[PDB]
Ligand binder design. Sequence first.
Ligand SMILES: CCCCCCCCCCCCCCCCCC(=O)O[C@@H](COC(=O)CCCCCCCCCCCCCCC)COP(=O)(O)OCCN
Ligand SMILES: CCCCCCCCCCCCCCCCCC(=O)O[C@@H](COC(=O)CCCCCCCCCCCCCCC)COP(=O)(O)OCCN
Ligand SMILES: CCCCCCCCCCCCCCCCCC(=O)O[C@@H](COC(=O)CCCCCCCCCCCCCCC)COP(=O)(O)OCCN
Ligand SMILES: CCCCCCCCCCCCCCCCCC(=O)O[C@@H](COC(=O)CCCCCCCCCCCCCCC)COP(=O)(O)OCCN
Ligand SMILES: CCCCCCCCCCCCCCCCCC(=O)O[C@@H](COC(=O)CCCCCCCCCCCCCCC)COP(=O)(O)OCCN
Ligand SMILES: CCCCCCCCCCCCCCCCCC(=O)O[C@@H](COC(=O)CCCCCCCCCCCCCCC)COP(=O)(O)OCCN
Ligand SMILES: CCCCCCCCCCCCCCCCCC(=O)O[C@@H](COC(=O)CCCCCCCCCCCCCCC)COP(=O)(O)OCCN
Ligand SMILES: CCCCCCCCCCCCCCCCCC(=O)O[C@@H](COC(=O)CCCCCCCCCCCCCCC)COP(=O)(O)OCCN
Ligand SMILES: CCCCCCCCCCCCCCCCCC(=O)O[C@@H](COC(=O)CCCCCCCCCCCCCCC)COP(=O)(O)OCCN
Ligand SMILES: CCCCCCCCCCCCO[C@@H]1O[C@H](CO)[C@@H](O[C@H]2O[C@H](CO)[C@@H](O)[C@H](O)[C@H]2O)[C@H](O)[C@H]1O
Ligand SMILES: CCCCCCCCCCCCO[C@@H]1O[C@H](CO)[C@@H](O[C@H]2O[C@H](CO)[C@@H](O)[C@H](O)[C@H]2O)[C@H](O)[C@H]1O
Ligand SMILES: CCCCCCCCCCCCO[C@@H]1O[C@H](CO)[C@@H](O[C@H]2O[C@H](CO)[C@@H](O)[C@H](O)[C@H]2O)[C@H](O)[C@H]1O
Ligand SMILES: CCCCCCCCCCCCO[C@@H]1O[C@H](CO)[C@@H](O[C@H]2O[C@H](CO)[C@@H](O)[C@H](O)[C@H]2O)[C@H](O)[C@H]1O
Ligand SMILES: CCCCCCCCCCCCO[C@@H]1O[C@H](CO)[C@@H](O[C@H]2O[C@H](CO)[C@@H](O)[C@H](O)[C@H]2O)[C@H](O)[C@H]1O
Ligand SMILES: [Zn+2]
Ligand SMILES: [Zn+2]
Lengths: 244, 96, 96, 79, 79, 62, 124, 124, 51, 217
Amino acid sequence: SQNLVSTFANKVIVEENLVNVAEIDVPFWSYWLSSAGFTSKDAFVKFAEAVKPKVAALSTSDITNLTVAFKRANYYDKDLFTGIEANVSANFTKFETEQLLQIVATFDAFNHSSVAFLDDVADSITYCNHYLAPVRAGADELATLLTYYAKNGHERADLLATVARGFSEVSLGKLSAAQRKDTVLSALKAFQTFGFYPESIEAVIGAALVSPAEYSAEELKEVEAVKVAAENALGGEFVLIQEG
Amino acid sequence: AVTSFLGKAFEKYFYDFSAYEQFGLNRFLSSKGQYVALRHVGFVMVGVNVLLAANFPFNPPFPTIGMCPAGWEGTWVCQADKAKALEMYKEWKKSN
Amino acid sequence: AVTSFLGKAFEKYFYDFSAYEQFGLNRFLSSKGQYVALRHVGFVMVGVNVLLAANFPFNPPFPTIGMCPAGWEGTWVCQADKAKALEMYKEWKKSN
Amino acid sequence: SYSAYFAKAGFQFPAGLSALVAGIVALNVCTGRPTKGTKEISNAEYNATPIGYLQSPDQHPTAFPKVPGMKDVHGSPHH
Amino acid sequence: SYSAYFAKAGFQFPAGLSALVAGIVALNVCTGRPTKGTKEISNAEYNATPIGYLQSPDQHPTAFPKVPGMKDVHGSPHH
Amino acid sequence: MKLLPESLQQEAATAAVVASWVLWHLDTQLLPTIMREHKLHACWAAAAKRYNEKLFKLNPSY
Amino acid sequence: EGNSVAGIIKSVNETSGANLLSSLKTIKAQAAPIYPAAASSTGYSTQAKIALFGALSWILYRADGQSKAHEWIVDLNLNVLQAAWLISFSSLIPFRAVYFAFRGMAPATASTLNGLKTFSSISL
Amino acid sequence: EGNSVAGIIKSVNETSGANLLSSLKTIKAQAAPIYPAAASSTGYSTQAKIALFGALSWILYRADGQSKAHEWIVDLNLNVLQAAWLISFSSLIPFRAVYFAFRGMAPATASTLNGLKTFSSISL
Amino acid sequence: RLLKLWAKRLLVSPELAIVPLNEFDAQLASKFEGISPKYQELLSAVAQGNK
Amino acid sequence: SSVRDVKTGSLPTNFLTGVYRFWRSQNPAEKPHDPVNDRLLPAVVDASDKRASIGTWATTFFCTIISCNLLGLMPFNEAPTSGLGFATGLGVSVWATATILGLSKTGFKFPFIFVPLETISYTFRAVSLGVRLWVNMLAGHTLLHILTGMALALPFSLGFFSMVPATFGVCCLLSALVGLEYLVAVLQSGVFSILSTVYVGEFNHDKFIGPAAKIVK
Ligand SMILES: CCCCCCCCCCCCCCCCCC(=O)O[C@@H](COC(=O)CCCCCCCCCCCCCCC)COP(=O)(O)OCCN
Ligand SMILES: CCCCCCCCCCCCCCCCCC(=O)O[C@@H](COC(=O)CCCCCCCCCCCCCCC)COP(=O)(O)OCCN
Ligand SMILES: CCCCCCCCCCCCCCCCCC(=O)O[C@@H](COC(=O)CCCCCCCCCCCCCCC)COP(=O)(O)OCCN
Ligand SMILES: CCCCCCCCCCCCCCCCCC(=O)O[C@@H](COC(=O)CCCCCCCCCCCCCCC)COP(=O)(O)OCCN
Ligand SMILES: CCCCCCCCCCCCCCCCCC(=O)O[C@@H](COC(=O)CCCCCCCCCCCCCCC)COP(=O)(O)OCCN
Ligand SMILES: CCCCCCCCCCCCCCCCCC(=O)O[C@@H](COC(=O)CCCCCCCCCCCCCCC)COP(=O)(O)OCCN
Ligand SMILES: CCCCCCCCCCCCCCCCCC(=O)O[C@@H](COC(=O)CCCCCCCCCCCCCCC)COP(=O)(O)OCCN
Ligand SMILES: CCCCCCCCCCCCCCCCCC(=O)O[C@@H](COC(=O)CCCCCCCCCCCCCCC)COP(=O)(O)OCCN
Ligand SMILES: CCCCCCCCCCCCCCCCCC(=O)O[C@@H](COC(=O)CCCCCCCCCCCCCCC)COP(=O)(O)OCCN
Ligand SMILES: CCCCCCCCCCCCO[C@@H]1O[C@H](CO)[C@@H](O[C@H]2O[C@H](CO)[C@@H](O)[C@H](O)[C@H]2O)[C@H](O)[C@H]1O
Ligand SMILES: CCCCCCCCCCCCO[C@@H]1O[C@H](CO)[C@@H](O[C@H]2O[C@H](CO)[C@@H](O)[C@H](O)[C@H]2O)[C@H](O)[C@H]1O
Ligand SMILES: CCCCCCCCCCCCO[C@@H]1O[C@H](CO)[C@@H](O[C@H]2O[C@H](CO)[C@@H](O)[C@H](O)[C@H]2O)[C@H](O)[C@H]1O
Ligand SMILES: CCCCCCCCCCCCO[C@@H]1O[C@H](CO)[C@@H](O[C@H]2O[C@H](CO)[C@@H](O)[C@H](O)[C@H]2O)[C@H](O)[C@H]1O
Ligand SMILES: CCCCCCCCCCCCO[C@@H]1O[C@H](CO)[C@@H](O[C@H]2O[C@H](CO)[C@@H](O)[C@H](O)[C@H]2O)[C@H](O)[C@H]1O
Ligand SMILES: [Zn+2]
Ligand SMILES: [Zn+2]
């Protein structure tokens, strides 16, 4: 029986029959296989064609699972993400901010944007979801959504007021010191792109000025470029609070 | 979802996935009706050997016909009376 | 039907049928609030006397304060220790 | 009004009351010990013993005792 | 066709199956006798006895015995 | 009288099962129902000055 | 199910100028919210049958255990003392006042719903 | 719910002579019998959840009792001998032929329904 | 078209008839809180229905 | 999968709203120094995250005890909290909930001759919270058992309907004792949950993570 198991192993338990079981529920199976590290381009081509007649009827949890799965596999199928962005645009009231921040980060990984998608995502975060949902988001996810709107030039000041609520000493403090640097430097470029300087930009600038040794000389120049621009917009002087 | 996939999965296994065709047993076997007779006794022989391999060091409650499993032949596994085999197993268990 | 009548029946009893008005207890009693205080203790006193009359010849598990029910005064009903009262009851039971 | 809509649904239990009565019963039946006045015995003793000797008088109190402490069965007379 | 109407109703039990499992369980729990390897004892004996002495070895067989007749508990050593 | 039970762990785990069911039934069945009914009233009462002002500025009817 | 205001707009626009005023009660009823009518009376639910038989089985089980107790006659008369207060609570408690006192415990029922006003949403 | 033939008679009589032939497919669909469409998929019924958990609880209870038996390894291998025939019955039994053999057991399904003929109920 | 316009408003919100058309502008103000309270509580109570 | 429909303004919804808002009122959130706006909104949500759910826990313990206490006043029924392991098992569970909350703040490390005496006062809250519930459900029912036996001795000995006024006066004192046990059943559920808000609320303190940077004027 040393070879009867090995004969069964080379023909039955193959990656191709792992795919043939995975064809029934692609948003479930591609999400959990890629979570286990199975990020293979040849299988995710077969995932993209199996789910394409089913995308328009997918739920918001299935769309978010499918979009995160194709981000971890790093596979871009433009006809798949067209139907994915047509599902988000048709059901934007049903989507959540926690789900849309994962969908936007996939749409920002490979540059894929529509003007209807940017409007329906901004309407979903600002009006269809709770206004304190960016507080629960995590600042690394909100800075990705800010960069995605800055790169497409889409100015939505109602969205920018909602996303800026998530930046604080709480949410930036939960990040790694290297990860806080990339979050601060990408949120300050997006706030300077639209010319929007909310009151919660004091936490983004203050996260850079309380620890400037992580930042370079040219980075502290563009931080204090935003700091003087927010000082004119908010009408005051920047001061660091010390507890006591 | 969890039930709708499992119905679609087992339907593919019951009908579409056949190991009689994928392994090419038409060369070795005559009929599909004699393959399922060999798959029947093959299922019994595996389930006998798996249930014994799941716990091999046991004294058998079934009567062995004067035969011993491995190189034991005097241990608690081969003892006829079970009251003696319980005392011999307790000495073997504390060492191992 | 069986439930719809019983709802209509008890609704008539709970609200429409009042024994405070049909018996004319306004002459004897001051308030309806003091009638339901007397109907409360009257319910307790009946339920005490009914539970005792449902089985009167019993030896009490509660301590009687040196008192006897009827003309017994030496029988098993009045015995202090229950091991003696069980033997005295068995002689009384075969006769009666 | 919506009064006739709410009379359509009858009595209903609370939503997870089956899991409450499952947990309360499983705490009373999966005790891991003999059941309150009984003792586990051998199979040789159980088969040889009549039902009347297998019962104990304390576990059968009288339903409405005329004397406090009356038992329904007398048990085994062998001490 | 009426095929999609009959797929609407899920699995259903037979119509009086609750009365069948009520009658079968009541024949197994209302036996009027101690439960298969136990014996009713006095309340004085039950309270004085530890749980390990209250159990018997025959009523606790080993789940996968290496020797036929292994018991999970040893019971009371007092004979 | 009854002072100590037959098992102290069984009576404590019964209290743990009953209180965890009430904790589950409150957080899952009662408080989502309570807060749907409370915060519909509470959000309307907290917005109605700013809601009616925002709606007044929007419509061109006047 | 489409919304009823767009059905009002569609039915008023489609009607003639001659029969507009007569057909306004028909358009009013087509946009009226559904209030389901009183259905046929059914005596007991299945879960209501389990609840009443289960409470009856529990009462008979506890009355059988109380009667076999040592202080058995004290246990059955404590059921008389306890059931007498359930009768007195039906007599004493102002059940309309307690209903409105509980209604004032929640802020959703202690006040009327203050929201959208008429002048802010007038459509001309 | 009125019957559909009187609705056919009412709709055909009320129609114009000009639009009679065009509206015949509309009157055909209004009298078509209702065939309810495929509803949304639900995974398990409540009674299907009791049946599968109850069969799983029964299997685990019987496997625990078989393993504690005296001839315990014979009991677990008798489950192998019994489950092997359940696999062989899925392979051998002609499930379409057995379905039509059972269909011929009842006289209601062994023949087609012979009843009312066309010429006896022609209405001119 | 004028009758059809007012038929839609009075089918949805029939309490607009308690305000005369010539006195509607005399209720308005720049802020909503400054709108005249002559018709506020009467409009809110007729809108609740005939019960 | 299909949840039931609820009528708005139902009496159990209005009762449980006022009950939950009462135990939430016992540990109110602290007013920050800064005005609450979009700058201070994440610090308010984070301060709410660091607060324990004492409002939810106390109305869990209020409803589970006032239901258990009133079972002792229903006919053919006894109170679960009249048993020792049930009532004290709830009180040690509250004390262990407050201790685990207090230990999770510092390090999960347990904090000259003064602190052994303050420890005895703290660990007596484990005993006294559940024992006060247990003795109140026991001693009121035990006194009811003795006085019902002494009230039964009169119509047993002096005739059933023979003489009324002596058995009337003891049935009035017995009826006032069951009404006192109704008051104790509601009060001891309240005292338990008041003290649970006090004990858990001692460790319900975290520092407000306010703005580290500000644009003043
Ligand atoms: C070779 C590698 C293996 C790959 C692994 C994946 C392949 C599947 C392998 C086997 C999985 C078995 C799962 C079967 C149970 C779940 C299927 C199911 O119940 O779904 C539907 C299908 O139901 C059935 O499958 C019933 C079929 C039973 C017929 C008997 C078949 C042969 C049985 C052999 C006897 C085995 C005895 C034990 C042997 C050890 C019914 O539910 P539904 O909601 O989807 O339907 C809609 C109505 N609500
Ligand atoms: C004076 C002579 C007596 C004449 C005899 C007839 C008069 C009736 C006497 C008492 C009969 C009691 C029967 C009550 C139970 C049956 C009523 C019922 O359940 O029907 C409805 C009414 O339900 C109730 O009656 C509940 C009322 C309970 C409130 C509490 C009242 C006072 C209780 C006092 C405590 C007693 C404790 C024990 C004392 C010994 C609900 O069902 P439905 O289907 O008809 O409703 C439609 C929804 N499907
Ligand atoms: C507080 C002040 C004093 C007030 C008066 C004293 C209080 C005690 C009075 C006793 C009356 C209690 C309520 C009366 C209930 C019976 C009358 C009744 O109305 O019956 C209805 C239902 O009554 C009941 O069934 C309630 C019984 C509750 C007892 C609970 C015992 C539990 C035993 C079973 C547990 C099994 C759990 C299984 C989990 C799946 C009929 O239901 P329906 O289907 O026709 O629709 C009407 C629904 N609104
Ligand atoms: C160890 C051996 C034990 C053997 C003893 C017998 C126990 C057998 C165990 C299986 C019996 C059945 C289990 C019941 C749980 C599953 C049912 C369920 O999910 O609940 C409801 C299904 O609907 C739901 O609500 C689902 C939600 C889950 C139920 C409860 C969740 C867990 C609550 C426990 C507290 C959790 C918090 C603490 C956890 C450590 C149905 O309940 P109902 O009949 O009372 O309501 C229907 C009335 N119309
Ligand atoms: C840090 C977070 C941890 C989360 C865990 C939460 C735990 C508490 C939540 C409430 C659930 C309590 C149920 C657990 C009971 C455990 C009792 C136990 O371990 O001992 C049992 C061990 O007994 C056995 O060996 C038999 C197996 C018993 C299993 C118990 C099943 C009941 C589980 C209750 C269902 C919980 C969910 C229901 C709704 C809340 C029986 O106790 P005993 O004193 O009578 O016997 C001891 C041995 N002589
Ligand atoms: C005969 C030739 C050989 C054939 C193959 C071998 C036979 C054995 C094969 C085993 C398969 C048996 C049937 C498979 C059932 C499970 C798969 C399935 O289809 O699940 C359905 C239901 O399956 C079951 O639940 C059946 C389970 C039956 C086991 C009974 C055990 C009883 C335990 C609980 C008793 C409690 C009684 C309570 C009374 C109120 C799903 O139901 P649904 O709600 O989605 O709607 C579909 C209804 N058409
Ligand atoms: C002595 C102490 C025993 C204690 C042990 C526990 C037993 C407790 C007894 C109460 C438990 C529940 C009793 C169940 C009977 C009432 C329910 C019922 O009437 O049956 C069905 C209600 O619908 C009916 O069919 C009513 C018809 C009556 C049921 C059975 C009639 C009697 C059959 C027995 C054989 C009679 C012939 C011989 C008689 C000598 C519901 O059954 P199902 O859940 O399986 O079906 C629902 C599936 N969707
Ligand atoms: C001429 C027409 C007569 C019509 C009557 C039809 C009777 C047969 C129909 C089928 C029903 C059978 C159920 C009756 C069982 C009676 C058994 C019995 O009397 O003895 C019990 C007496 O035991 C007890 O004292 C405890 C009480 C047991 C009550 C039994 C309840 C079960 C009833 C089954 C439900 C029937 C309906 C369910 C669906 C058919 C227990 O038997 P045992 O040998 O284990 O113990 C004897 C004493 N050591
Ligand atoms: C949508 C379905 C609705 C169903 C309809 C049911 C309607 C009947 C209500 C069910 C009865 C529930 C019994 C609960 C009793 C609680 C008593 C209470 O709420 O206290 C007072 C609360 O009112 C107060 O403002 C406080 C006055 C001091 C009273 C002290 C209250 C403590 C009582 C605790 C209960 C102790 C005994 C427990 C009995 C089970 C009520 O008095 P009031 O309305 O006359 O006073 C309001 C001013 N007019
Ligand atoms: C389970 C058995 C029962 C145990 C119940 C124990 C909890 C009882 C909670 C109710 C007690 C509090 O009683 C509460 O009193 C306050 C005032 O203080 C009332 O509050 C208000 O009532 C009404 C509002 O409609 C007005 O008169 C007034 O604005 C105010 O008094 C509440 O409406 C009442 O519910
Ligand atoms: C529970 C496990 C299974 C146990 C089952 C035991 C009972 C089995 C009953 C079926 C056996 C009887 O088998 C029965 O044969 C008769 C002929 O005799 C067939 O009767 C008919 O079948 C078809 C009709 O469509 C035609 O070929 C023909 O008219 C006739 O043969 C039945 O359709 C078949 O069902
Ligand atoms: C040990 C001896 C007993 C063995 C076990 C007995 C099993 C009993 C179940 C088998 C019964 C099946 O018996 C079945 O009877 C039905 C009655 O509807 C017959 O039904 C059919 O008969 C004939 C011919 O097939 C058809 O023309 C007819 O339309 C139809 O009614 C089937 O032909 C037969 O297959
Ligand atoms: C031993 C001490 C503890 C005893 C037991 C404690 C019982 C706890 C339950 C009683 C709680 C009832 O508490 C209830 O709180 C609600 C919160 O919605 C208050 O609710 C109401 O307050 C005020 C004034 O009444 C209203 O203007 C307001 O609209 C409404 O919210 C009630 O006034 C109060 O009656
Ligand atoms: C007719 C008049 C009606 C008056 C109604 C108001 C009184 C109601 C009485 C119910 C009990 C009052 O509840 C009371 O709540 C306060 C806070 O609110 C608790 O106060 C507690 O708060 C926190 C909790 O750790 C501690 O910081 C504080 O030191 C402690 O006192 C009391 O310990 C409790 O007794
Ligand atoms: Zn008692
Ligand atoms: Zn066997």
